[PDB]
Amino acid sequence: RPVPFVLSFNNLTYNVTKTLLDNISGETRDGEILAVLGASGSGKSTLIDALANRIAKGSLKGTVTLNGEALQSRMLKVISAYVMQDDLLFPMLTVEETLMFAAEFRLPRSLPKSKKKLRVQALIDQLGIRNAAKTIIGDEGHRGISGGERRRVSIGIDIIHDPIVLFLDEPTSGLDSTSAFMVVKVLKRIAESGSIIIMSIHQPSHRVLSLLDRLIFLSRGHTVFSGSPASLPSFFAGFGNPIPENENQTEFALDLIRELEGSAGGTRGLVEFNKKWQEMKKQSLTLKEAISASISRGKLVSPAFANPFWIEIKTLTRRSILNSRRQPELLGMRLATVIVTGFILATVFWRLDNSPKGVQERLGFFAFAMSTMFYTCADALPVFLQERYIFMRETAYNAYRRSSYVLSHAIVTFPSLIFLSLAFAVTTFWAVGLEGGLMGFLFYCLIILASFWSGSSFVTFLSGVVPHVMLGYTIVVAILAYFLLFSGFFINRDRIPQYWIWFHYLSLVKYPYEAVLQNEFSDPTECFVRGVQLFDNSPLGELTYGMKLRLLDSVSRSIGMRISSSTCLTTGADVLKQQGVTQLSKWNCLLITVGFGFLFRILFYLCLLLGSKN
Amino acid sequence: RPVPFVLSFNNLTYNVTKTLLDNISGETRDGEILAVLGASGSGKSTLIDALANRIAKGSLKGTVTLNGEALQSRMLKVISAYVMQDDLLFPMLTVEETLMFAAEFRLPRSLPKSKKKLRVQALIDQLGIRNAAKTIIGDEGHRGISGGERRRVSIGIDIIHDPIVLFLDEPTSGLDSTSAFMVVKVLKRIAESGSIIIMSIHQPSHRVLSLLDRLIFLSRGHTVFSGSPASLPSFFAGFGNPIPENENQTEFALDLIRELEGSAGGTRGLVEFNKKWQEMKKQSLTLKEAISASISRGKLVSPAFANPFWIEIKTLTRRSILNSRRQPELLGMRLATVIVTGFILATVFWRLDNSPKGVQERLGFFAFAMSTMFYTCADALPVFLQERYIFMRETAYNAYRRSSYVLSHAIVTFPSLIFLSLAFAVTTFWAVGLEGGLMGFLFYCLIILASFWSGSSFVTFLSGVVPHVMLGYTIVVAILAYFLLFSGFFINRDRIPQYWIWFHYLSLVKYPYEAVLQNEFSDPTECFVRGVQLFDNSPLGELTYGMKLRLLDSVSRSIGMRISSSTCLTTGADVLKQQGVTQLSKWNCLLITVGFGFLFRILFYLCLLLGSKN
């Protein structure tokens, strides 16, 4: 009643030299489940990777055939689906929405959402999940569905377009033996429609072999047994190792392979008996209209991408402002280190005066404040490396572009950066007593938000060159401490040596720290040294007010000027010349702060161009 | 041929109220394996915790009986061993040494090591590991033995004293079905000696029921089936649900238990049939000399602790200076952030002059240098939380004291802190051009080592109040940044407000930063402002030198002193009074740096006193 398909791979030789696979031939129908078995890395996978064309063309030789005719990689990516050995899903997003996000990414948009809603409703019944249709997927801290019932969802994402041939790389690994049965029970329920399934089971159970209809055993790139599980007693009995009854088949037959991994035993005594066993059982058409008949059966619901790049952006935004709504303790940890640091910094540096020490306390406030923006965003390396393992899975199916992923991941962090930036700028502006009034408050809000923007762009760029969270945190703290050393606070710009001046200008803390200094120390009325404050902290300077004016009028008798106690010697424009903060305006220091944000999002896109292509 | 033991628990009611267990009766022999089965938390464990007295006395009611005699917790800790559901071993330490460290901790020291070396040799043959007797245990990055051959070592650690009754909490979880067979094969080989084994399997295989001799099934604290696995077809057939042949028993009979966890099915229809099935099968000695006869058989090789506290210190030292030699990339990451930061800090701050800016660059060097000591030791939170999960396992068996664990963990870090402290002090002393000569170099070496010691003691104290590495790193960087803000570098001591002065004095960076300042700025010959350097960076200060002497002679005609270009106004003793660094000597700032190291190792011992008694 389905349309009959025949996949028949032949003479596969995969070399890398290594000769990792050597002369594997096979045949599969629909209705059946071809299971490929191996011991611990025998080549069970790298045969699933070889039949899905996921290795190389040229390093594999051998005709892969479907319906008795040749097969190229253009047809096997609209017709097939490879299910990786993971469950990389978002921890929120209940399982009607996980499969509806994967619906709109991958099913074409010429379909209405009305037909697309029942395709997910057909799939949610074909899978054995209706108790979990309204419950959260639920990672280790927010438990919401079962472990082997997550597996039918990640399997179900890849069958959103209802493929014909379905490659699965160990779909029952890490599952208990009674939920791994219902995985293979719904897999044959998929295969009871017009579907070919080539999966690589690691050590099947006993109740599962009511479903597997054809087996292949591999010993380091050589086939050892190839046939039905009913012929599995009759094969091993005729080889010289009979089978114990009332005992689990396909386990006795599999560790007997492993005992022949000895020094002189060898499975080479099995590879030519496998060649003589095939000879004794010979007892005795335009696939694109067979595909077109199998589209009209109801399969193959699925262009390079199924959406333009302005619908993949609002699908990836809606998916991540809904995954982040349902756990508001990520913006309760990036906000309880901004309110907490904003309360500490505003009460230590409470109402700083116009003193020579209060000037040096402003530079110490502005360097500790403008480094909080770069550390606060470092507490997203858990979630930034949580996706890009989901992105690397979803771009194998061409669900969205990599350009459309960076532009959507930059957008959704930005409403949570505006609220962190005016929670630090409301706390530490009227308490520290910063200068500017209101147009100098809005610049303080702007440069906090632009330092959150380039500090979250820098650590989303590193999350994309690092493999794990803990390595990409001890070099986030190490780089953002060398960015602070070179900001011009610890050592000024004109005192940094010539061989280190390239890294002064490449510092991400240099440009916001120099922007809050010109926002604060540019006021012609504010005076930090007034006349008889000239002699304060030198040995000349512990005098009294009486002889200070004779000391000050005598200086007036030496240059030709007239200096009094109302002369306003050191303004705010001379504080900046003492620090070397004279090369750029505060808006050009706000431009380079934003322009280093956009640099690590173009450099992030190029590391998605390399690490996903390789 | 062994000494016959019986264990016979009766009428166990465990309440917490909850009534987690009620009226569980049973009986076990030596020679046999009692397996307790349940679905997903039925009470299979917390019956193993109930029979090992590992929950509460008073919240458990019911007599636990051995050899027809009562049993108390003093006897079941010399006679028994509880095997937790983990494999927490050191990743190095090949398996002849892992079991020989557990030998010397737990076997008594009146034994010579000659008998103790063959007790490990008898155990390594009783276990099925002789191919792995000379290979490293091998964690995920440095693989050396199998996944199921780690399980026989962690099981083997707890049988180092060769107990009689052996409780195992899921000893075959996370194992493939053919290495989990050899776990239960060596368990019955242990049980073929005079050993009682009460283990709680999760969904056993088919080839394993040749080894289990008695079963107990639990449904939310109620026994359901209790008997041999041979009687497991005959029980369910007489209940009303017959068994399919050529199919795995104890899996059919266990998912049928989960089927009766429905809305109106209930396993209460099984609990009184379990009361009538026990009635139909009744067709039909001085324990402490039975133990004494079972010592002379060769069991019970095993005082509160088996060693005084000066041999537990050198056993824990030899175990960790051998685990750390075999991975010298832990002291190649704490040393490539000290040579790298030492090379960066010594080339930015290369040869600082006696200038008003070079004085402020010394305080910025000394505050960035003395904070490197506290961050470099923060890259040990992976390994500090790697043990204290091995310590919490090994103090259930009284292998070592918790006082003897802190004193041994402080000792072995100290030869790696001396080498990091003179790699930072050789790099950044003659390049930055620090003052003191040679007796001011040895103090620079001392206060770097005392800040490594204080900052490795602070993060070993937090590793002991935090549950995981990633939480105990974003609050290590956050606290050691607020320690740096309050050190007196960003805001001075006499400018910190009165409500924040308690945290200035509690700052761990305050005392080494103030110790390198008095080591540097205490020299009566070094001068930072000389006579006509009085007017440098004021509006007075863009003058010419030719008139500056009469600008300075006019000062001399205003106080009564005589100032010239050789007066030496600002020495190093006046730099310290301008910073407020006047309250303690440099040795009393070195004492409090060491005394905060010893405080977070006494506070670490108290958090091992709380979290382990919990």
From Swiss-Prot, chains A, B:
Keyword Transmembrane applies: yes
Keyword Oxidoreductase listed: no
One GO MF term attached to the UniProt entry: ABC-type transporter activity
Record's bilayer topology term: Multi-pass membrane protein
Binding positions (ATP): G38, A39, S40, G41, S42, G43, K44, S45
TM stretches of this protein: 330-350, 365-385, 406-426, 450-470, 471-491, 590-610
One of the record's GO cellular component terms: membrane
Similarity remark: Belongs to the ABC transporter superfamily. ABCG family. Eye pigment precursor importer (TC 3.A.1.204) subfamily.
Name of the protein: ABC transporter G family member 16
Species of the source: Arabidopsis thaliana (Mouse-ear cress)
Gene that specifies this protein: ABCG16
